[PDB]
Amino acid sequence: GKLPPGPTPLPFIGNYLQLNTEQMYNSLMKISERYGPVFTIHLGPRRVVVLCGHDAVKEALVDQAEEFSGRGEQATFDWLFKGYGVAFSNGERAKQLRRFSIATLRGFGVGKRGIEERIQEEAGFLIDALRGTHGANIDPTFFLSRTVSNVISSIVFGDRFDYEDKEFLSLLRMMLGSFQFTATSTGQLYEMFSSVMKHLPGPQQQAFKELQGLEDFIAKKVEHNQRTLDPNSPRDFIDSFLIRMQEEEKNPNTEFYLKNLVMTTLNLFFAGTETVSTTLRYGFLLLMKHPEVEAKVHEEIDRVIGKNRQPKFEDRAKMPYTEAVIHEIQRFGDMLPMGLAHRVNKDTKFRDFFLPKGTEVFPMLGSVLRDPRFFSNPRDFNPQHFLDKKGQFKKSDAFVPFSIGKRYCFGEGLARMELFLFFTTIMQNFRFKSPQSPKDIDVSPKHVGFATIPRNYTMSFLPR
Numbered sequence: 001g002k003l004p005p006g007p008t009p010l011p012f013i014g015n016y017l018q019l020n021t022e023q024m025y026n027s028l029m030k031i032s033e034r035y036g037p038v039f040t041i042h043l044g045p046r047r048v049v050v051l052c053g054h055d056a057v058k059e060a061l062v063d064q065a066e067e068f069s070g071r072g073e074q075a076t077f078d079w080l081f082k083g084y085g086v087a088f089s090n091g092e093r094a095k096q097l098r099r100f101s102i103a104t105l106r107g108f109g110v111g112k113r114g115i116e117e118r119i120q121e122e123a124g125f126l127i128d129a130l131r132g133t134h135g136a137n138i139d140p141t142f143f144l145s146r147t148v149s150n151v152i153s154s155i156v157f158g159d160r161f162d163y164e165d166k167e168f169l170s171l172l173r174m175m176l177g178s179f180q181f182t183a184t185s186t187g188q189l190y191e192m193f194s195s196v197m198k199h200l201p202g203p204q205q206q207a208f209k210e211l212q213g214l215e216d217f218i219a220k221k222v223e224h225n226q227r228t229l230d231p232n233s234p235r236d237f238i239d240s241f242l243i244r245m246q247e248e249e250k251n252p253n254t255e256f257y258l259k260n261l262v263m264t265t266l267n268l269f270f271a272g273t274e275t276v277s278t279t280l281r282y283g284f285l286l287l288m289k290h291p292e293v294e295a296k297v298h299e300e301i302d303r304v305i306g307k308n309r310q311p312k313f314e315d316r317a318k319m320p321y322t323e324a325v326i327h328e329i330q331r332f333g334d335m336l337p338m339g340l341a342h343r344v345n346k347d348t349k350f351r352d353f354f355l356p357k358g359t360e361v362f363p364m365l366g367s368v369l370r371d372p373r374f375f376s377n378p379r380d381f382n383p384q385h386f387l388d389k390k391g392q393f394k395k396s397d398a399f400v401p402f403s404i405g406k407r408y409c410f411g412e413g414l415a416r417m418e419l420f421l422f423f424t425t426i427m428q429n430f431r432f433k434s435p436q437s438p439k440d441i442d443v444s445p446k447h448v449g450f451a452t453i454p455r456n457y458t459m460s461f462l463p464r
């Protein structure tokens with residue numbers, strides 16, 4: 001008969017007086033200390049059930065998986081996507097788009113050799129580019145995102161972008177500004193009060209324009225692809241989707257139409273660019289702050305692999321310390337703190353509470369990555385979190401940065417391959433120094449909201 005407890009809201013504003021839009025994660029955690037790991041919060045007029053720590057999140061998303069498999073709102077992205085595409089759909093749409101995308105991703109070689117060689121080759125152009133700097137002092141931002149983007153772009157668009165291409169650069173700028181915006185106070189305030197704020201001047205309009213620009217681009221590529229489409233041989237993800245469109249025109253409740261094509265392709269391009277990009281970014285800063293951890297990775301690379309051969313994905317099994325470090329980077333980086341919002345499909349019973357149909361659910365993925373029962377020093381950067389006393393790699397059940405449950409990151413295979421081979425080919429060739437001193441490096445997040453954004457920095461790439 002009852003909603004979980006939480007602080008008393010006010011009309012329209014909800015729990016505004018208890019939330020700090022600069023630090024929403026620290027706000028919900030603070031309310032947690034008082035109310036328990038399972039509480040109700042009103043983000044303006046939206047009613048939201050928050051789940052903190054491993055047990056509550058798992059119990060929701062794994063044990064009652066089917067009830068918690070809907071999608072709640074992320075307002076900024078909703079403005080553009082409007083319930084279309086894979087990421088921000090629900091019900092029958094998501095289930096259909098999700099299964100298409102997974103099967104197609106498998107068909108383009110994901111988690112197999114075709115994509116390994118494409119990443120290996122693409123990692124080559126990155127080294128080359130990084131040498132083309134001659135150890136000068138640079139922003140690594142768009143060096144990483146150009147290399148990262150090209151992997152998913154081979155798959156969605158059919159071929160890589162050229163690095164000098166001015167439109168490519170413009171797209172990666174759109175992506176980074178959009179994403180960043182969601183991590184700002186204004187972006188979080190935008191989560192409570194969007195119905196008024198969408199009609200107002202400020203940083204949000206900029207975000208809309210970048211998203212529109214990204215939509216403008218995919219929508220053009222598609223018109224192109226439609227006219228040289230060869231139905232028995234797809235060049236790309238766009239082709240595959242267009243073929244499925246034909247096969248299904250005689251079904252009027254099909255999910256396969258133009259609008260879901262544009263939006264899903266956008267999902268992949270955006271998610272397959274900015275996540276790995278940002279994680280590599282954060283990860284570089286972390287290693288520079290911790291140069292002792294940097295040397296053991298080097299040591300372990302020089303012995304399983306060498307100077308000679310390109311690193312390959314299966315090289316990880318014999319490289320326990322490097323895998324611990326990659327996990328610890330993802331663990332500390334905390335890409336999305338509050339996950340993507342969930343919602344219950346139906347009236348649901350959960351631990352003595354009742355959630356009416358339609359209730360938004362925040363599973364706080366950041367609080368699982370920081371759960372004290374699973375990690376000895378949660379707020380520190382410490383590879384030993386993923387190693388035994390033997391130095392073998394150890395799994396954690398709270399390593400959930402890709403989430404869990406019905407709506408899990410189906411990009412996981414790809415990201416993990418990319419994360420591994422990109423971290424490893426770069427450090428094979430380079431060691432990192434910064435203009436700044438290891439004890440003076442700020443590894444605290446620049447922005448925390450929907451995403452976790454590392455501070456702006458510069459570094460140099462010096463050969464080995």
Ligand code: HEM
Nearest residue numbers: 086087271272275276279335340401402403407409411415
């Ligand atoms: C640093 C790497 C990445 C992280 C930390 C990450 C994390 C996540 C998270 C937390 C979700 C939400 C899951 C949920 O709602 O419970 C998600 C979903 C999703 N991700 Fe990733 N991801 C990463 C890489 C990628 C890549 C490379 C792709 C490209 C194919 C991708 C595509 C997607 C899509 C389409 C969804 C929506 C799935 C759905 O709604 O059912 N992600 N990811």
Ligand SMILES: CN1CCC[C@H]1c1cccnc1
Nearest residue numbers: 077087266267270271275340
């Ligand atoms: C970054 N992402 C991982 C989960 C959703 C996905 C995303 C976010 C915004 C726009 N498109 C895709």
